[PDB]
Structure formats: structure tokens, C-alpha cells
Amino acid sequence: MAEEWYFGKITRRESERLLLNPENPRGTFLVRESETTKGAYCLSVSDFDNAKGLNVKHYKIRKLDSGGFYIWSRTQFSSLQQLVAYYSKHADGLCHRLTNVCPT
């Protein structure tokens, strides 16, 4: 049992398959393990614009030796739960604020 938004070892294309479901509104997200970087995580979030329609953006979450996490070094967090809590309040760099936890 992990956090509701933690999807573990799912692939980048599987995260897109789940997030691109038309029933999921803009701002739907999940956190997963990175396929490209060992020890890093990815925040995958759905967005919408006039050119692309519903699309997915992926953000790399790096873990520090001190135990912290960040997407941009200017804003660091002590846990993944603090990171999700912050980005649920302000977009601050992301395409959209986190609003809906990806189902199933």
C-alpha cells in the first residue's frame, strides 16, 4: 500500500494511455519510477490546449543525497507528499496545477 497517486514501475507509454482517457479532466496526474534515470521519479500530468487537444507532459523528480526532492532546484521538498501538496496549490512551472489523481 503506497500513496494514491503513486503508480510505481509503469512505463511512460502506459502512463500516457491512462492519462489520455477522455473521462479524465485536464490536470490529472500520477507519480511513477523513471525508465531513463535510476533512482529518479516522474510526475506525469495531463493538459489541454487548442493546438494539441488533450496531451501529457512528463517532469523528472530528482532525489538529493540529503533526502530531498525537486523538479527545479529553486524549490525543494522533504518528501514526495510535500511535492504533490505544493503543486496541487500552484502550477509554478508545470503546465497545470495538480487537480485529479489518476484512477485505478
| Name of the level-1 CATH class | Alpha Beta
> What is the CATH superfamily classification?
SH2 domain
Oligomer: monomer
Q: Which outline best applies?
A: globular
Total of helices? 2
CATH architectural designation = 2-Layer Sandwich
CATH topology type: SHC Adaptor Protein
Please indicate the percent range of residues in DSSP E strands (runs of 2 or more): 25-35%
**Secondary structural class:** alpha+beta
Let me know the number of strands. 6
Helical content class? 10-25%
Q: Supply the number of structural domains.
A: 1
Between the first and last Cα atoms, what is the distance in angstroms?
A: 13 Å
Q: Helix-strand pattern, N to C?
A: HEEEEEHE
Strand order of the largest sheet: 5-4-3-2-1-6
Largest sheet: 6 strands, mixed
Radius of gyration: 13 Å
Domain SH2: 5-102
Subunit structure: Forms a complex with polyoma virus middle T antigen. Interacts with AFAP-110. Interacts with GJA1 and PXN.
Organism: Gallus gallus (Chicken)
Family: Belongs to the protein kinase superfamily. Tyr protein kinase family. SRC subfamily.
